[PDB]
Design a protein around this nucleic acid. Structure first.
Ligand SMILES: [Mg+2]
Ligand SMILES: [Mg+2]
Lengths: 181, 138
DNA sequence: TTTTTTT
């Protein structure tokens, strides 16, 4: 009840860039945890089709990283539309969380929220407006617990959405274990 | 030390306020407290006042926006004050993130945690984060 | 325990 309302909706996106006016979502993953960061449910992990012209125009960082990770190719091969992706993610969180009560969670997840607010508004209607930004806790750890910050996880296994989620949960667990009372 | 400062902002016609704290949440400098029309001084002049202020107070690109759910403020400022946001880091210090963790992990303490003026909103946010540091951090 | 990057 209150336990269900204290779940967290962990999301990570890959995009063609950081320009909300032109860039698009190309990968999205979602995990549900309970309030103590135990993974309760693994949602869709989807590569979303976007136009060839947009991928050929990406920044140098995106061209390099999304090419080497295999993401650009998978996007070109994907048959999943933005609208179908949104359908699957909304179906998932409907099954897992009470409407309006649970926050998005992840590293600097406000950026993902900007993109989801634009491109998956029906998904975002299911969520709270507050976020659990693990990078806020990162910045506080850096300032207030610099010794501990030396040992915190920082880098995911890949610049792919599901690996980023996995690392973000592990980083928050590290902060809970090392800098909270 | 200067790289660990924080740029506190709040937006509430829109009223915008800003101030600077050090890493330990001590207020170092009060910035502009201004009123603009939603898109009394123009948006561009307001943006210059805030950008000039943070240029005098923080190193470029290094310091985060801070406040309660300050990602909402950041969405607005990213669109309408992009030259101000260029001076700042892309990470934020979202006090409401610490609130949500307090509510889950420290419910007893949460029960004691901390006007509609923007400067008052900043003051409350700093006090709330200080309460969390004092009561739920190691 | 880590490996200065929101994409
Ligand atoms: Mg990430
Ligand atoms: Mg990534």
């Amino acid at each position: 009840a209150a336990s269900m309302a204290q779940r967290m909706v962990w999301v990570d996106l890959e995009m063609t860039g950081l320009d909300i006016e032109k860039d698009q979502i190309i990968e999205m993953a979602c995990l549900i945890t309970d309030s103590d960061l135990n993974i309760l449910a693994e949602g869709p992990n989807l590569i979303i089709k976007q136009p060839d012209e947009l991928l050929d125009s990406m920044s140098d960082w995106c061209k390099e990283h999304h090419g080497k990770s295999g993401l650009t190719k998978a996007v070109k091969e994907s048959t999943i539309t933005l609208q179908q992706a949104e359908y699957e993610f909304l179906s998932f969180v409907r099954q897992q969380t009470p409407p309006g009560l649970c926050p998005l969670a992840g590293n600097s997840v406000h950026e993902d929220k900007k993109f989801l607010d634009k491109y998956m508004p029906q998904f975002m209607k299911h969520l709270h407006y507050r976020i659990i930004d693990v990078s806020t806790v990162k910045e506080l750890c850096r300032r207030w617990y610099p010794e501990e910050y030396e040992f915190a996880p920082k880098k995911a296994a890949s610049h792919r959405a599901l690996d980023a989620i996995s690392e973000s949960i592990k980083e928050l667990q590290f902060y809970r274990n090392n800098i909270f009372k | 030390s200067m790289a660990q400062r924080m740029v506190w902002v709040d937006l509430e016609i829109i009223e915008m306020a800003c101030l600077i704290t050090d890493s330990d949440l001590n207020i170092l400098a009060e910035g502009p407290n201004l009123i603009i029309k939603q898109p009394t001084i123009t948006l561009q002049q307001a943006e210059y006042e805030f950008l000039s202020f943070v240029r005098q107070q923080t190193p470029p690109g290094l310091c985060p926006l801070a406040g309660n759910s300050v990602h909402e403020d950041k969405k607005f400022l990213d669109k309408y004050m992009p030259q101000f946001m260029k001076h700042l880091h892309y990470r934020i210090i979202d006090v409401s993130t610490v609130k949500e963790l307090c509510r889950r992990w420290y419910p007893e303490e949460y029960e004691f945690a901390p006007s509609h003026r923007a400067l008052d909103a900043i003051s409350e946010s700093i006090k709330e984060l200080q309460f969390y540091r004092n009561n739920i951090f190691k």
